[PDB]
Amino acid sequence: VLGGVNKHSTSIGKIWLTVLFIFRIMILVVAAERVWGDEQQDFVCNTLQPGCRNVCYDHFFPISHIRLWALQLIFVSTPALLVAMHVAYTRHERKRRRGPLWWTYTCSIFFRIVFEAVFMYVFYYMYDGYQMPRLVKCDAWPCPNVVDCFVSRPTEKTTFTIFMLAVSGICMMLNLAELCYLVIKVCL
Amino acid sequence: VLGGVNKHSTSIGKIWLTVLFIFRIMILVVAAERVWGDEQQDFVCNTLQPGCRNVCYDHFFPISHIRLWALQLIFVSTPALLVAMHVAYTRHERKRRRGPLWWTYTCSIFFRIVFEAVFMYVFYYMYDGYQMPRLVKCDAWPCPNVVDCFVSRPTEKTTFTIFMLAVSGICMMLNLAELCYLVIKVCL
Amino acid sequence: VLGGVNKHSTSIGKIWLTVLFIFRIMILVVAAERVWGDEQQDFVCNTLQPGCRNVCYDHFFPISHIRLWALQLIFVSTPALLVAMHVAYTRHERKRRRGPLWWTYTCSIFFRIVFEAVFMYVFYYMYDGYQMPRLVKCDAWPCPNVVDCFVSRPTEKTTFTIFMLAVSGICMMLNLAELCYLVIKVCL
Amino acid sequence: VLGGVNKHSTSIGKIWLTVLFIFRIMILVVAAERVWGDEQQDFVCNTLQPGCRNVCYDHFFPISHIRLWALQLIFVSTPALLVAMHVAYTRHERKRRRGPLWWTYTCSIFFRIVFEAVFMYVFYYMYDGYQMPRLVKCDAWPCPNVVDCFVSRPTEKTTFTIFMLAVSGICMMLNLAELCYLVIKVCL
Amino acid sequence: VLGGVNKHSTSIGKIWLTVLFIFRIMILVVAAERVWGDEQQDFVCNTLQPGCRNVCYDHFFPISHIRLWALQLIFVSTPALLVAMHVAYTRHERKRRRGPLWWTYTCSIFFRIVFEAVFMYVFYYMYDGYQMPRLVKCDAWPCPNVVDCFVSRPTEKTTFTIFMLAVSGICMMLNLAELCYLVIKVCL
Amino acid sequence: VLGGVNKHSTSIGKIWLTVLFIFRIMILVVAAERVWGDEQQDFVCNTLQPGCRNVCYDHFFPISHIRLWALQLIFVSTPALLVAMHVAYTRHERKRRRGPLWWTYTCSIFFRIVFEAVFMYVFYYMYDGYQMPRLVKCDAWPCPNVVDCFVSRPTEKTTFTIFMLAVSGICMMLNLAELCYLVIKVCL
């Protein structure tokens, strides 16, 4: 909350973006330890081959969904943290002894859009959609021929995937709108 | 508590709604990790088919009850959080340099009613009542014919479902009463 | 502690009731996650029938003892919380612009007695005493004929049941004494 | 720490008793969840009789050691908490409008000795010493004849039992010394 | 944050190094209990020999990755903690009664580089790269001949290894730049 | 930190000893719940005898390594806590109404050395070195003849044992140096 206030921030940055960020954190907290907790423990494969459970789970879930969203939240909150430290350093220096603050705030908004877009593209490149399947067919060594494996709680995981994707998409649109608001105001 | 006080709020909003919100949170905290902890682990099905446990549990419990209530609490508390930030932003601007505060508070009450009603309808659309069955009959692939499966702690889960439904219904009535109090006062 | 002080409260309400409430909370904290943790996991039944463990445990323990005490503590502390908010609202209004405070405090004491009495009656209606048995005989479907099942830590659970029942009984007596003290003082 | 200071307390009550109380809490914290965590889970009995593990563990450990020490700490800290509230109530009343404080402090010391002595006598009546055996022989129904059962971590549990017994014995001696110091001073 | 500010610190030390340190801590928190939690529990070996799982896991993972990073963070933050205490001690002494502060800050930067370099060399000496294999072949006694063992979540562990190595490399470069900035300024 | 400052403390006690104490606590926190968590659970013995796992683990690990270090930290921090309370009691008395503070500080240093040496001797008397074996041969009843048992994570446990022993040895040397500094200063 505190690390989201600047003298150049409009109502969108002060209120709407801050609420959405808290919204994403709260959803992640209640859906991490309980929904994705038994992702590998309850991954069931119809085989007797030792080691087939480990390789098939790793093949279809190279990075867990919750770990991807945790990384995205850390990355998109970094520019806000950097700006806050710069403000304190400048405020300390000014007392001791647009402008520079305008460029730092504008640059932070640009990097927030880039990080938001990159992480959802990684999601689509890696899981080709939001729908978690009930069944995965795995043929990696040492599994003989093709082995059927069953995912844990596919429906609940799909529901939370739609929530995070929808909020992340809204966050980019708000960030894009704020970038346009600042640019046109200084230009015209 | 703090994010529930406005200069247009009556006694109902200041006291009764705040207590009920804390009441729902406290009940959720004591009944989440212990009552719904072993929902899938102690889901027992009378079969030898691999993967039948995963598909049958996911078929009858697409979203866990506690996750639905956690989502509802987050949604119904969002309008209160939005109003508080708007007050601080307006208070900061007024010093730096009915009305707008009346409309923001009135709009937040309307959205609280909508979110409360939507989540209760979703519950009845998804679980068709408050009574958790002891036995569920599942015929989804790969389960052969119809398989008997047994739920964990059905009676305790039914009791807490009644508590959350009753308090949610009371909270909707109180919000409706406060909305009527403000409308008639300004009209007459 | 703070939510237990009013200008009409005598020494009993200020000191003895506050200490007993903290006493009940402390006992519950140390005896919840460790004594009742494995209530169903270590519930052993002498049978080969799938699903008999789930139905027999649910039949004899419809609501866990710790969950009943947690609900009781929440209920008996609600009237105290309601009084505190009313005091703050009245104190704010008086500055901005017996009596009403006497009736609110008296009413809160009455509801504390009712909630205390109701929860112990529910305990006796549901578990017909304080002694937890070592053996339960269960004949609910699908268990064939009558099945022997064995409870986890029956002696330790009996000891803590006596503690909570005794303190709850003492708390009801103290509340009754305080109610009589206020009534006779105003009457005579 | 704060709830252990009174205007009639000598150096023993202010310093030595406070340090010992913190000493007992710290030892309990590091030795509860890890040493006694698997007391029943790793209780191994040489039998095939269902339910023999539950009844034999309950017969030889009716109350766990850590739960007994947790109860003792709660009881012996109650008189200190009662005195603190009485001081605040008297201090508030005096401003609003030996002696009584001397008797309350003296009575609290007496009850601390009684609670300390009662809990160790219960320990000796219940476990007849400090040495935890490696083997227990159990003949309670339904165990056939006599069944050998093996305790988890008997040596480590014995070591911590000696620590708590030694500190509890020292605490009584300090409390007894403080009681004698106050009595003779007022008498002579 | 507080233990990273000195009167001789430039913008790099005040802002960039502080953010990166928080960045490394945040990544470690979200990836410790969930990614490396089941490292040995889900270590599957294709054998019937008792004890082969323990010796093969210990042979290939003598120190866990998360424990190595936790040790590195503790070591690289020690010089900053030492400087802060020296500042407070000097500040207290000066009131009671370049220079010495310049040498202490310069020395702390040097030790941060050394600790950073040592821990990455230990990583390459011990795990000869960043890629975690799916399969390990173990022939330590008592495993007969050569036994195949399978690692848990090799792909996710590889991804986080790249993140920590990259940030640690960046932190070493920033520390080197700050050291050069101070040396040339005092020299010329 | 606060409980390590006295008016007679030199730079060694104020800075170096405080940092080392925090250093030992931080290492213990990250290496307790994860490295020693499965000490008995993953203790594997090559036998079919019931109860042999319990007696052999208890024979070779009478007290866990982490519990020994936790006890040592509590003991060596007690004299520092005792001194702080004595300072506050003396400071309160002086206002109400070398020297004594010099002897209390000197005595606390002496007891810190004794406790540090005693716990290190107990470690060598009990585990005869820092190297944890991979294999232990156990012949206690009821294990028939000699049974092979395998330790969990012996290499990682050895590494952390060296760390704690090295820091404890350094802490003893620093305490000895500070004791010599005070004695010679007062003598000459």
Side-chain angles (χ1 to χ4, degrees):
Chain A
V1 176
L2 323 175
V5 174
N6 205 23
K7 93 164 156 139
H8 287 252
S9 37
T10 91
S11 64
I12 298 177
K14 285 179 177 180
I15 316 170
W16 295 103
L17 279 173
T18 315
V19 167
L20 280 183
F21 183 75
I22 301 170
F23 196 88
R24 263 190 296 183
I25 290 198
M26 296 303 321
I27 287 199
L28 199 64
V29 154
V30 317
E33 223 141 59
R34 273 319 186 185
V35 178
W36 269 267
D38 54 14
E39 44 190 354
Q40 181 170 235
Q41 189 210 90
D42 285 330
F43 193 76
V44 179
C45 294
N46 191 342
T47 190
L48 274 177
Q49 178 68 49
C52 187
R53 206 268 328 257
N54 278 27
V55 300
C56 291
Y57 176 83
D58 185 72
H59 176 264
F60 282 103
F61 303 99
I63 310 183
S64 183
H65 281 54
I66 41 156
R67 251 82 76 187
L68 260 173
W69 294 324
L71 281 173
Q72 163 176 237
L73 284 190
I74 292 165
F75 267 87
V76 302
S77 88
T78 290
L81 192 80
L82 273 167
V83 157
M85 313 280 266
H86 190 254
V87 155
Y89 149 95
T90 294
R91 181 223 59 61
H92 156 67
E93 183 287 355
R94 168 232 61 185
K95 157 195 51 54
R96 193 61 69 234
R97 316 302 140 190
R98 288 193 57 257
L101 249 61
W102 188 90
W103 290 99
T104 56
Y105 188 68
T106 301
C107 261
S108 78
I109 297 180
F110 173 74
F111 274 110
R112 264 197 250 124
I113 299 168
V114 166
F115 289 150
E116 214 98 59
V118 158
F119 269 92
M120 289 186 311
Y121 168 88
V122 161
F123 194 111
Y124 267 91
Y125 164 85
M126 248 192 60
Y127 290 115
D128 73 4
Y130 58 83
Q131 174 79 246
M132 194 141 315
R134 268 191 182 163
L135 184 99
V136 290
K137 294 191 180 291
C138 159
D139 60 4
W141 187 91
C143 306
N145 314 301
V146 179
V147 170
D148 282 358
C149 296
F150 297 89
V151 185
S152 173
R153 317 166 179 260
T155 302
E156 192 162 27
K157 288 174 180 169
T158 295
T159 299
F160 278 101
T161 299
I162 298 183
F163 266 104
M164 310 288 308
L165 283 186
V167 177
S168 296
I170 293 173
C171 279
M172 228 183 327
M173 286 320 100
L174 283 186
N175 270 299
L176 241 185
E178 197 161 312
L179 190 64
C180 276
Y181 193 78
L182 293 197
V183 159
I184 67 175
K185 235 185 84 154
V186 85
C187 277
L188 307 183
Chain B
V1 176
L2 323 175
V5 174
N6 203 23
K7 88 155 157 138
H8 287 252
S9 36
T10 91
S11 64
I12 298 177
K14 285 179 177 180
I15 316 170
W16 296 103
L17 279 173
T18 315
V19 168
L20 280 183
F21 183 75
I22 301 170
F23 196 88
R24 263 190 295 183
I25 291 198
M26 290 288 347
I27 287 199
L28 199 64
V29 155
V30 317
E33 223 141 59
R34 273 319 186 185
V35 179
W36 269 267
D38 54 13
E39 44 190 354
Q40 180 171 235
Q41 197 222 315
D42 284 316
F43 193 77
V44 178
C45 294
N46 191 342
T47 191
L48 274 178
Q49 180 68 49
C52 187
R53 206 268 327 256
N54 278 26
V55 300
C56 291
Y57 175 83
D58 186 72
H59 176 264
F60 282 102
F61 303 100
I63 308 183
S64 183
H65 283 233
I66 41 157
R67 250 82 76 187
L68 261 173
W69 294 324
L71 281 173
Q72 163 176 238
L73 284 190
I74 292 165
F75 267 87
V76 302
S77 88
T78 290
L81 192 80
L82 274 167
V83 157
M85 311 276 267
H86 190 254
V87 155
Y89 151 93
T90 294
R91 181 223 59 61
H92 156 67
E93 181 284 4
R94 168 232 61 185
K95 157 195 51 54
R96 194 61 69 234
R97 316 302 140 190
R98 288 193 56 256
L101 249 61
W102 188 90
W103 290 99
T104 56
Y105 187 68
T106 301
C107 262
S108 78
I109 297 179
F110 173 73
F111 275 110
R112 264 197 250 125
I113 298 168
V114 166
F115 289 149
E116 208 101 59
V118 158
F119 270 92
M120 269 165 90
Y121 172 80
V122 161
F123 191 99
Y124 268 92
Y125 171 80
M126 247 186 64
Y127 291 115
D128 78 15
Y130 58 82
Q131 175 79 246
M132 188 139 302
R134 267 192 181 164
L135 164 72
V136 290
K137 295 191 180 291
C138 159
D139 60 29
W141 187 90
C143 305
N145 314 301
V146 179
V147 170
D148 282 358
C149 297
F150 297 88
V151 187
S152 173
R153 317 168 179 260
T155 302
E156 192 162 27
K157 287 173 179 169
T158 295
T159 300
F160 277 100
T161 298
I162 298 183
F163 266 104
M164 302 298 285
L165 283 186
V167 177
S168 296
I170 293 174
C171 280
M172 209 195 312
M173 284 320 87
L174 282 185
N175 271 299
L176 241 185
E178 163 130 341
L179 190 64
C180 288
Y181 194 97
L182 293 197
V183 159
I184 68 175
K185 235 185 84 153
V186 85
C187 277
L188 307 183
Chain C
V1 175
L2 323 175
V5 174
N6 205 23
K7 92 158 154 143
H8 287 252
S9 36
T10 91
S11 64
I12 298 177
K14 285 179 177 180
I15 316 170
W16 295 102
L17 279 173
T18 315
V19 168
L20 280 183
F21 183 75
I22 301 170
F23 196 88
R24 263 190 296 183
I25 291 198
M26 290 312 317
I27 288 199
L28 199 63
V29 154
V30 316
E33 224 141 59
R34 273 319 185 185
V35 179
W36 269 267
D38 54 13
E39 44 190 353
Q40 182 172 235
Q41 166 196 127
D42 284 346
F43 193 76
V44 178
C45 294
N46 192 342
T47 191
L48 275 179
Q49 180 68 50
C52 187
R53 206 269 328 256
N54 278 26
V55 301
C56 290
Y57 174 82
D58 185 72
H59 176 264
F60 282 102
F61 303 99
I63 310 183
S64 183
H65 281 54
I66 41 156
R67 250 82 75 186
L68 260 173
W69 294 324
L71 281 173
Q72 162 177 238
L73 284 190
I74 292 164
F75 267 87
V76 302
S77 88
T78 290
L81 192 80
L82 274 167
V83 157
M85 311 279 264
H86 190 254
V87 155
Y89 149 95
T90 294
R91 181 223 59 61
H92 155 67
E93 186 281 11
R94 168 232 61 185
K95 157 195 51 54
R96 193 61 69 234
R97 316 302 140 190
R98 288 193 57 257
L101 249 61
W102 188 90
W103 290 99
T104 56
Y105 188 68
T106 301
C107 262
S108 78
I109 297 180
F110 173 73
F111 275 110
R112 264 197 250 125
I113 299 168
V114 166
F115 288 149
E116 217 92 47
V118 159
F119 269 91
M120 323 213 306
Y121 175 79
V122 161
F123 196 95
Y124 267 91
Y125 166 83
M126 245 189 66
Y127 290 115
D128 67 7
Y130 58 85
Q131 174 80 246
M132 182 145 315
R134 268 191 182 164
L135 183 98
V136 290
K137 294 191 180 291
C138 159
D139 54 36
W141 187 91
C143 306
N145 315 301
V146 179
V147 169
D148 283 358
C149 297
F150 297 88
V151 186
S152 173
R153 317 167 178 260
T155 302
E156 192 163 27
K157 288 174 180 168
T158 294
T159 300
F160 278 101
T161 298
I162 298 183
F163 266 104
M164 314 288 309
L165 283 185
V167 177
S168 296
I170 293 174
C171 280
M172 206 182 332
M173 286 317 101
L174 283 186
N175 270 300
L176 241 185
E178 169 128 335
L179 190 64
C180 282
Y181 194 101
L182 293 197
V183 159
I184 68 175
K185 235 185 84 154
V186 86
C187 277
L188 307 183
Chain D
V1 175
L2 323 175
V5 174
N6 205 23
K7 93 164 156 138
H8 287 252
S9 36
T10 91
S11 64
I12 298 177
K14 285 179 177 180
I15 316 170
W16 296 102
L17 279 173
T18 315
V19 167
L20 280 183
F21 183 75
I22 301 170
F23 197 88
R24 263 190 296 183
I25 290 198
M26 296 303 320
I27 287 199
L28 199 64
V29 154
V30 317
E33 223 141 59
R34 273 319 185 185
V35 178
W36 269 267
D38 54 14
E39 44 190 354
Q40 181 170 235
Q41 189 210 90
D42 286 325
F43 193 76
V44 179
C45 294
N46 191 342
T47 190
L48 275 177
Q49 178 68 49
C52 187
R53 206 268 327 257
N54 278 26
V55 300
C56 290
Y57 176 83
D58 185 72
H59 176 264
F60 282 103
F61 303 99
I63 310 183
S64 183
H65 281 54
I66 41 156
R67 251 82 76 187
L68 260 173
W69 294 324
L71 281 173
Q72 163 176 237
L73 284 190
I74 292 165
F75 267 87
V76 302
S77 88
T78 291
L81 192 81
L82 273 167
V83 157
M85 313 280 267
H86 190 254
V87 156
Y89 149 95
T90 294
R91 181 223 59 61
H92 156 67
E93 183 287 355
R94 168 232 61 185
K95 157 195 51 54
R96 193 61 69 234
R97 316 302 140 190
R98 288 193 57 257
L101 249 61
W102 188 90
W103 290 99
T104 56
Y105 188 68
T106 301
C107 261
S108 78
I109 297 180
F110 173 74
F111 275 110
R112 264 197 249 124
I113 298 168
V114 166
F115 289 150
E116 214 98 59
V118 158
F119 269 92
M120 287 188 310
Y121 168 88
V122 161
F123 194 111
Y124 267 91
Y125 164 86
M126 248 192 60
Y127 290 115
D128 72 5
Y130 58 86
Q131 174 79 246
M132 194 141 315
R134 268 191 182 163
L135 184 99
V136 290
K137 294 191 180 291
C138 159
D139 61 5
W141 187 91
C143 306
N145 314 301
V146 179
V147 170
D148 282 358
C149 296
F150 297 89
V151 185
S152 173
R153 317 166 179 260
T155 302
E156 192 162 27
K157 288 174 180 169
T158 295
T159 299
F160 278 101
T161 299
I162 298 183
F163 266 105
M164 310 288 308
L165 283 186
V167 177
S168 296
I170 293 174
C171 279
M172 229 183 326
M173 285 339 264
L174 283 186
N175 270 299
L176 241 185
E178 169 133 308
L179 190 64
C180 276
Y181 192 78
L182 293 197
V183 159
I184 67 175
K185 235 185 84 154
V186 86
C187 277
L188 307 183
Chain E
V1 175
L2 322 176
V5 174
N6 205 22
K7 92 158 154 143
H8 287 252
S9 36
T10 91
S11 64
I12 298 177
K14 285 179 177 180
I15 316 170
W16 296 102
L17 279 173
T18 315
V19 167
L20 280 183
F21 183 75
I22 301 170
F23 196 88
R24 263 191 296 183
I25 291 198
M26 290 312 317
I27 288 199
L28 198 63
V29 154
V30 317
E33 224 141 59
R34 273 319 186 185
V35 179
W36 269 267
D38 54 13
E39 44 190 353
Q40 182 172 235
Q41 166 196 127
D42 284 346
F43 193 76
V44 178
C45 294
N46 192 342
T47 191
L48 274 178
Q49 180 68 50
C52 187
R53 206 269 328 257
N54 278 26
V55 301
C56 290
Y57 174 82
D58 185 72
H59 176 264
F60 282 102
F61 303 99
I63 310 183
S64 183
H65 281 54
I66 41 156
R67 250 82 75 186
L68 260 173
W69 294 324
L71 280 173
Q72 163 177 238
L73 284 190
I74 292 164
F75 267 87
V76 302
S77 88
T78 290
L81 192 80
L82 274 167
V83 158
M85 311 279 264
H86 190 254
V87 155
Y89 149 95
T90 294
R91 181 223 59 62
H92 155 67
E93 186 281 11
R94 168 232 61 185
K95 157 195 51 54
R96 193 61 69 234
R97 316 302 140 190
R98 288 193 57 257
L101 249 61
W102 188 90
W103 290 99
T104 56
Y105 188 68
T106 301
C107 262
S108 78
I109 297 180
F110 173 73
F111 274 110
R112 264 197 250 125
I113 298 168
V114 166
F115 289 149
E116 217 92 47
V118 159
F119 269 91
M120 323 213 306
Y121 175 79
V122 161
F123 196 95
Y124 268 91
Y125 166 83
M126 244 188 68
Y127 290 115
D128 68 6
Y130 58 85
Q131 174 80 246
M132 182 146 315
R134 268 191 182 164
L135 183 98
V136 290
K137 295 192 180 291
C138 159
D139 54 36
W141 187 91
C143 306
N145 315 301
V146 179
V147 169
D148 284 358
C149 297
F150 297 88
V151 187
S152 173
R153 317 167 178 260
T155 302
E156 192 163 27
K157 288 174 180 168
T158 294
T159 300
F160 278 101
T161 298
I162 298 183
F163 266 104
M164 314 288 309
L165 283 185
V167 177
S168 296
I170 293 174
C171 280
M172 206 182 332
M173 290 312 99
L174 283 186
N175 270 300
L176 241 185
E178 169 128 335
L179 190 64
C180 282
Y181 194 102
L182 293 197
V183 159
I184 67 175
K185 235 185 84 154
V186 86
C187 277
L188 307 183
Chain F
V1 175
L2 323 175
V5 174
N6 205 25
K7 92 158 154 143
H8 287 252
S9 37
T10 91
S11 64
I12 298 177
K14 232 190 298 303
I15 316 170
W16 296 102
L17 279 173
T18 315
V19 168
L20 280 183
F21 183 75
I22 302 170
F23 196 88
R24 263 190 296 183
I25 291 198
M26 290 288 347
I27 287 199
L28 199 64
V29 154
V30 317
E33 223 141 59
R34 273 319 186 185
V35 179
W36 269 267
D38 54 13
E39 44 190 354
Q40 181 171 235
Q41 197 223 313
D42 283 317
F43 193 77
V44 178
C45 294
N46 191 342
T47 190
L48 274 177
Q49 180 68 49
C52 187
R53 206 268 327 256
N54 278 26
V55 300
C56 291
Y57 175 83
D58 186 72
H59 176 264
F60 282 102
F61 303 100
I63 308 183
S64 183
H65 283 233
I66 41 157
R67 250 82 76 187
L68 261 173
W69 293 324
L71 282 173
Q72 163 176 238
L73 284 190
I74 292 165
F75 267 87
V76 302
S77 88
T78 290
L81 192 81
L82 274 167
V83 157
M85 311 280 261
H86 190 254
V87 155
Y89 151 93
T90 294
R91 181 223 59 61
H92 156 67
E93 183 287 355
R94 168 232 61 185
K95 157 195 51 54
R96 193 61 69 234
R97 316 302 140 190
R98 288 193 56 256
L101 249 61
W102 188 90
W103 290 99
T104 56
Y105 188 68
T106 301
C107 262
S108 78
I109 297 179
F110 173 73
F111 275 110
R112 264 198 250 125
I113 298 168
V114 166
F115 288 149
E116 208 101 59
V118 158
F119 270 92
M120 272 165 90
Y121 177 74
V122 161
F123 189 99
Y124 268 92
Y125 170 79
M126 246 189 64
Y127 291 115
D128 74 18
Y130 59 82
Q131 175 79 246
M132 188 139 302
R134 267 192 181 164
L135 163 72
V136 290
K137 295 191 180 291
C138 159
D139 60 31
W141 187 90
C143 305
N145 314 301
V146 179
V147 170
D148 282 358
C149 297
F150 297 88
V151 187
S152 173
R153 317 167 179 260
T155 302
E156 192 162 27
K157 287 173 179 169
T158 295
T159 299
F160 277 100
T161 298
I162 298 183
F163 266 104
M164 302 298 285
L165 283 186
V167 178
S168 296
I170 293 174
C171 280
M172 209 192 312
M173 278 330 84
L174 283 185
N175 271 300
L176 241 185
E178 163 130 341
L179 190 65
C180 286
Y181 194 109
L182 293 197
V183 159
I184 68 175
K185 235 185 84 154
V186 85
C187 277
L188 307 183

